[model samples]
Target chain A: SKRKVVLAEQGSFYIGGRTVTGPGKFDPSKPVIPYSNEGATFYINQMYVNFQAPVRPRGLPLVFWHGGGLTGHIWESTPDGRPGFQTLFVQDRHTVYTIDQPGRGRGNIPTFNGPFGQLEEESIVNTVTGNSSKEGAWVRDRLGPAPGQFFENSQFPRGYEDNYFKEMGFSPSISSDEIVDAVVKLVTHIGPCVLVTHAASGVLGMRVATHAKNVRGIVAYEPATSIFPKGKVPEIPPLADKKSQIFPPFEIQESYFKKLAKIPIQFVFGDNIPKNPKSAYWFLDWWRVTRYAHSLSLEAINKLGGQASLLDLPTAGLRGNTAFPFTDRNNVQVASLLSDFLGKHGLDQN
Target chain B: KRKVVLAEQGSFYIGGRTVTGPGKFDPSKPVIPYSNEGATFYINQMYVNFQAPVRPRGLPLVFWHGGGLTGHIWESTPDGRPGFQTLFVQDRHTVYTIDQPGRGRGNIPTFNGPFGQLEEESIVNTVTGNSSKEGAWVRDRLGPAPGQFFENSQFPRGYEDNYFKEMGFSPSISSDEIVDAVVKLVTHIGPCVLVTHAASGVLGMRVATHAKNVRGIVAYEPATSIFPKGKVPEIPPLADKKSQIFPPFEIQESYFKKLAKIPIQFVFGDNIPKNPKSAYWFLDWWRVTRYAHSLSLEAINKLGGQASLLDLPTAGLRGNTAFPFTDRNNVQVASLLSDFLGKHGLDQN
Candidate 1:
């Protein structure tokens, strides 16, 4: 029932050599990094934390979301030999941050084993199913509910009836709400932070930004939103009906901008539309199309007290709809613009 | 006999069941489902209906499907274009479009196994069956677990025999198999120009890079080892490079030293994200051709044999289109490809 918390502080800041503080509560001498809301000692204990001063100049700190069925180490390795968020973003003069969300990564529920224990994994042999069945009641009860509901809720249709057994089957009941809570907590800890979400965490990002503070900007490349928005249309002809279209709900855009317009928000998508419909996004370039719609929503938000924009890239694959350094034309343009904006706003001084 | 340029009827399946069935348990098969796979599917083939070009090489104009569709889109978009560009419906170049292996009429296959007939279909077919007319009735009439002709059909069998073979379960057909099929088809067609886009672009690249006695390639947005990948700080810029170039000019210098020798012309689309024209050129001219040669020599020496890199004599560029077939934008280049190959003794057998 108790969450493990730590206040392990290490070396000086990579940029300024400022004495970075520990997982401690409100230390004045060092750069205080808070986690687990407050008085949070364990890095994994808290939902939010601050990276503090000494953020690399021109470095956009990252808070990478672990992939569905996986952990946050997904983007740890940077080409040209860089390790973790620090090296990957710092050396390049970019701030880097990643969150171990409530269910999977650092903020993961302790009772949970690894990914295999999650109810979403669905244990099924040749003939019989185990996890989803009543017989595996103990496995379901131990963890409370499924581990990564952040991923599952987004994957399943909205308002999907909860299979009580399935929920109980998970070592713990992880939901999109938990993921959002973690992001909100983290944002509150690290005020004025840029949020990056990938794959399933994109759902968490949408939820988090909607109800958070200090989200200076959000750069989501391939968040799997529900459908394409209206007005900003898919370049693919015919413009199928909105409902039938894999289009994300128009409201998510309105909501995302409505909440995070104070900060820069952009979406990146892969140009390669899956020829197979079952393949993510199917006929539509979800990253591009949805983000395009997001940009429109941003303008609409401008009309409705928000500032958000959507920018798609032809990056070989999805950046989770976030801007990569030079993968896409539009991404490059957006990043350049963001760089200028950050510079003008002095956000890049870190 | 000329091969028919029409799509054959095929069923859509997911999870071993018919997503789109006809006269069978899946009654929803009748409707020609539009693009949305979330709802319905259809048993139909796309076409590359040709008007018969001026320079028919007796080579069939086939449509190559995108990687996943398993069927040609049967649309004219992939091919550069007609009139404005001397590709597709233009010239003697008999165009050939194809559905990639697993999609199109290929989705339907008879698989004998546990579970229902729908089990054999694709996820798209399975889901669509649940929502469409065929799916609703199948559920209502068949009653969840009830059995019927849901399993019996030549669709699965044919798919297993023809397409599933490409899955690489058997050592007989590797990725090279697809390339070989195109080679043989072209040989059968006799002296045809191969135009490719997207993933098929990779296949074309392999063919041109390895095949012998093939006339010049009219590669439109051909895939690249380096393209579609994010830019390295060392690589050069696509257009007007002011600075902030990447992979360091030294790496590019070494790379271009090699590409300057390959006997091929390249074209790119400006809209493309990966592999911009300038960067692509830098790599093709420097690395692929030059560095590749260096590696070849080292490899040959290690193997105790002579090695060589192809000489790069003539190279031309087309603007706008990623794969070089933007009719109006790159028409001059298509003719140029023909002219260059013809001059180089490559246009004819």
Candidate 2:
């Protein structure tokens, strides 16, 4: 609807990082030109946050955290050049905080502390298009049964590949626990709020809801890893050097699940990650295990007297959704689902 | 069916030149994998979000952010108030807010080589200077002791923390890239006025001079004043020796002569150290730059340029900080700015 919305405020801030001393000594006498580095000490690793507030009051402000290799940009504007979830949800009447998690995006990284995995252009091309059917290379399935072809129901705008890839970034693998620490602080800073996390950041939200006393709820979009309480570790190979394998459930203390169980949780998956029994692509098999892990977590939460649900977009007949429904052409439809859950939980209380 | 539509809104990218990097490598291969010889990646491009009213008049308002900030600076304020972005759009002035090269949504790994953050103390004391109840910021001797603000200053009091939240990391990317990117933006948007803040003021002046598309500029405390080669003699030392406001960078006489044609307004607020020796408002430095700007503005007029400056306190408006458009009295400030545009006929297409 092209109607007036009360967009009262928008601002940005950095949270949770420490400082650093340069490689040179701060000798006032010397040119200190150490040439390349500043002699003085400075800060690093702080997460950058941008927010929009509406004039009229609403429920808990929504904090949107981006996935690994991306910034809050993932939630701001789509690849095909349309308003993203940041604007959509704000228009939907929610104060939204979109962040570049520490060590990624605009957040300063002190150094590449370790050898992290690299993402290639071809890998993304195959993952989304299902263009490749081979295991090591060009493999395909129903979603992208051939090169450059997609399921007719696909919502990802075709030929916008360059725009999408341009938004991707690289960072040394910072510890997830470190990320959890920063997000917990962010949630604390914002006070009681719901976390809308995507991809690798999804697990951090789950951890934050457990760690931060202020967290109200969580909405995870096709999370990269599923975490379950200790007793429920599913039978799967542990995450090792192989980059394509589905990460096994991250087992945590039973108490964390107990904490999470009290909050509302929703796991959203787009139809693009097909639940196929037999397929040549690695992601097809990846889903089988990922789904299994999610099912266990859901079961664990329900058993512990917590509220948890999953939105299987494909099962609901929302087809070819590129796994990240919010980036799909029908992203507005995807964000509405979040509004639905917020309303249901009384989190959107006006 | 002429319906009253608020405006059309969308976003696009521009100004980024692409380069090729490591093309591919088999993850199946050994450690430090991947061939670095070949892949396409974008560096220095920026993201711009714009809004246009159904009856937009004048040219668009192209916003360039400052150091330690993003396009969000013009979007809203520390306290929740509809910012100039919304206000201008409501007044039928389309606004385009953009991140600098390698910043915010425009961020990419390849720019700046490596990035850093402003120390927290630097943020509170310098970047987003504040008036504090606890005076936690007085340790730095750069400005007015943390507790005091100039009489009738417009700095928001209760929202001290909000001011801190309005800051982020800066792009140390080559100022050349920054200038080139913004110039590309104006070139793409066609003729428009530029509303720049802090460090971006310096950039706005550069971009405006380079691209004739700029109709006017509302600059809030540009870091320093610019000059043509031999436009003015080098400034004397500040209270601190080893420094001058205008860098050694030169503007071509032809460009400076032509830049005078654009109406450039530099607005300053109350917290400035009116005393040349009073180096405490923002790093004990603004007064010196203010000195440089005064002489520079004189030089602009000498060259037949329309460059003018407005210090709120001097004009009796009072209560402004480096962040005027996002301050408590921003509405009043916006009104003054609209009049500036109207004076220059920049408020109409």
Candidate 3:
């Protein structure tokens, strides 16, 4: 009951504090820092471990990304009639880590109130408006790369911060890479891991996949890339909409990543949807993207003598692109396909 | 349209004001002791003592605590709401938070045999309710004090014990035990939507998988444990016996196969990160991928995928952490998953 519990380190990384270390396994004993580096400080308050059926000698290492407006605890924490996300993975015999990224869930954020310390006057916007000369002051005091954020503890709207600036959308900023680096360093300590992302952060999943060579694979469902309506080439007139001009000359650090060279990708599409154009061929993107990424990854891996493939689901609901339709009304032939995949692979073996 | 069951019956309060040594009950309300004859703790009523939600007519959500913790912890103030049930009600959904039969407000069931925290939190010990060791944190001191004690105006200075810190045990322990409790409660709520965060995501999935009628699932930051393992393909059975395809290589083959048969959605937070190289492993080994896997939409177009990335002459990491990334200028990434789902005809109800 009162036994001494020693915290273990999986790897060393750098967050705000210098040289932080992380753990590979879910130590019921202590925290997991993303990594330790130059005056970088990444503090993890707790290490969560769960008992998964189809038990294994040790749970597999899994890394989870929180959605916008929420913290780390949100992923695994429970509510009435509902279980946390961590329980899902652990039940499959996987050791999982849910993170409180910078700016939320024990991340960086300000506590001091405004001049009056009242809600109307004590908001980020209020601070900016009240202190005309303190424009930069709010910027400095606002949530940083790893501190308090806007979407903490909530579901991020499809556009999220992107909806703010007409031209300056919520694409990955330089600080995000630091986040990726932090995650990578943590992974180095933890054994091979499967990276998972949801909502707006799904972009980070792709970015990480391309950047972090150690990440085993990625699983994302209903990522927040739904703001933009589906785009298509003009048929008879080839007409172009200026607002829809989101092609040519755009780029991301994880753009054209080679490290994800041989990585296999999985997509789970849900039965629920948002609106119109955004939903067109929506789930199909899973297949389209997987196949394309596989070809690209295969090219890189084959250069090193390796191979890969992409499994696309014609219909999966809310879970991911691969998830099948619910209600069994379709009694779709897809079930046979999935059964074949799991059995053929050593997945059920833990 | 359905009248929700506000609380679980046949339970008793233990710690806080209910415990003999540490806590005492109110003189106004009659003292109800554990029904040793029934060998059960009947939860007549607990905190929040209010009516259930009325709109959207969805399934009522119930919460459970991990080992050494009580249902009180489950009801701790979150987002200013005293408990998640309160928060969900504020969010406009009917909800319930329970402490099982032994832990939290549950009457300590006296039973024979060696019982670990698991049994104390579970219905496993039907013969005797007593657990091997006295359930620690059987009564939470950190939870919001009883409002009734303070005339519903003021309760003991909102008690608070960092849940993770006070309970040495990991959140994982409670997840398993809670799954069973959730199944039982499902009978009360019946055919409802399920949602869980972090470690609970696993539990949510388990519950959804087990309860065939569960129509929807929203999993955020589904905790660690999911990875892309190198899976071998399953060869079809002799095509003659009409044998079922069991244990497939990829999840898309088995998991997806089953999911394709239902309604569930996995939501991940941006703060969470995955193994980078896992991408190669996942695609190469498992043969599953998403539309975002491709950097460019043209490239995606070739594969019938929907990613459209602009060409960047320079893209790579700088100073170990810095990078020269081109802003999509107006592209917001979160919509990708949902948009895709919507395109496939799945979205917010």
Candidate 4:
């Protein structure tokens, strides 16, 4: 059973005034042509909200949020040229909402907030594809960053460098706070919905939950650690003996912690973390921070009586998940895993 | 717009067509599907899609995918990228990607033979670089899996469901059968550049030995030479290379002498040295292959033949990896291969 669906956008613009005009053959003598300099104040945050009821709906809508340097396009089509999460979830009978974060994709802002920064293609190549010239750190993801390279297991699309670079140009400016604000408002409009976030947007889910009254739960996919309470804290070795471990509480607001504690939270991490030298230490650091933060957050939630859990992909036999698991070759498996998680939390029940 | 011309396309059984298994006598009666035995008398068969624009240069390039994979290896990558098909086409070389016997389109109605299903855990660990202790260096080299630091990985995480579905079973075909099938392909296509990966590596060698038309040979991490003592398997000295036995069966000096005249290259990715588990397997295979190559090199050199080894560390293409055709470095590898062929006058100018 299919019906007409409207692809809509909530658009607005930023307005700025030009007090004076530059000399461009101006008719100053004739009437001082008053030029009205009106900068378009617009932000087009698009969404596809359909009432596609799954055979067994989780009884709640699943809102998808993309990560940094990406847009809702991430959920539109997989890298393998297959239908992505939007189609998958919809086919599964769930009303799915794929949105472009403010200042990204259809959610663009007119003016640049910060000087557009240039990322060394190497850095982008390294972080996004895990390709590095380092002795042991290399990715077969793209044309080896240099000549004569030989990667045997890279899965990146071949001969799409132009498309990749074009997509790469859609990176977000540094003002993430604005992004958080816009997402919070969107969630408020569709409250009591399940929030699923990936990569850099992982923190956005928690932030939206903090402000929105209807946010039911959060599914963080390799979320950034921005949600950790700000401040210099001593590092504690993760996986250390419990007696030797010190999980200091994060400096989050009590009310915020309480709200988060009320919702079930699940953090998902893909495989290859234990051995990659590129981010091995970073992962270790992340584990420490997230471990402490999650522990503390859960403690607060459990005290207030809530639930949370962490998912390790390798442990579940879904290993080799790259940064963009949604686009990985085995994405259906990943989606199924998420669906399973949703089912466990009563999100997959109609 | 780049024009792509499909040259020749078809498929056939190499050794012989399928032989029916036990059961069934009524030809006029409604025949049962699985009632009689399946086509047990199976032989290696493959479908080749040759693509090029104009008169293709030197020998058509024959691409053999790794174990559990089909000719899709040379097609578009899982990431929607042009694979060796486009790259080689652009190079004006006729590309031939075939589904090896017992996999994918090559799974002709085969008989009930011993087939081994890959363990999911093992597959996950191997493909994802989460190898066992001995294979840990593979993990160390590929680095923490993707998503650890939000790192990008070339492995198609989303496509695995379909990839796994496509991965059914590799019929327990004898090495001789494997060699015969490939040799038949070379004979059918005429002299060509042979590229092999993983399980097909050793098969490529045997094919080269049997088929005199193979102009050049390139093996990527072939599964050859397993030394029980962790030392390089001993190969007959080049002076005595004529007496060497090349797996399953011995080869004639004339055939080996022909191999000596052909140019060959062995390409190995980096980061296998330190993997405890992977190292053991990798080293055993490497030493064996290396020893074979060294002997071949000496024998070929004695007869004025050219051979070389390529260590991809400088190219930053390393790791306990397989299936180089789909990697980001596919083009680089492809480019290097074409250039190598060009250097050896094996490519169409």
Candidate that would win on TM-score: 2
Docking quality (DockQ) of candidate 3: 0.01
Q: Write the per-residue lDDT of candidate 4 for residues A261-314, one digit (tens) a residue.
A: 777888876554433212322333334444455545545456666687777776
Quote the positional error of residue B112 for candidate 3 in Å. 59
Native contacts retained, all candidates in order: 0.00, 0.07, 0.00, 0.00
i-RMS for every candidate (Å) is: 29.1, 10.5, 28.5, 28.5
TM-score of chain A of each: 0.51, 0.84, 0.47, 0.66
lDDT by residue for model 1 (A1-350), tens: 01111111101100100011123242222111111112211111123121312222454455656434323333432211113333323434555564444433223232111121111133211211111222112111111112222221121122212211111111123445555665676566555666766545665676676787666666565554532233443343212223233344534544454565566666544333333222222223223344444555456545565555554443433332212222222333434544554555455665
Better of 2 and 4 by TM-score: 2
For candidate 3, the share of real interface contacts preserved is 0.00
- The sequence of per-residue lDDT tens digits that candidate 1 reaches over residues B133-165 is 112111112111112222311112221111111
Error of 2 at B221 (Å): 1.6
* Alpha-carbon RMSD, each predicted model: 26.3, 8.1, 30.3, 24.9
lDDT of each: 0.33, 0.64, 0.31, 0.49
Candidate 1 chain B weakest ten by summed lDDT:
B163-172
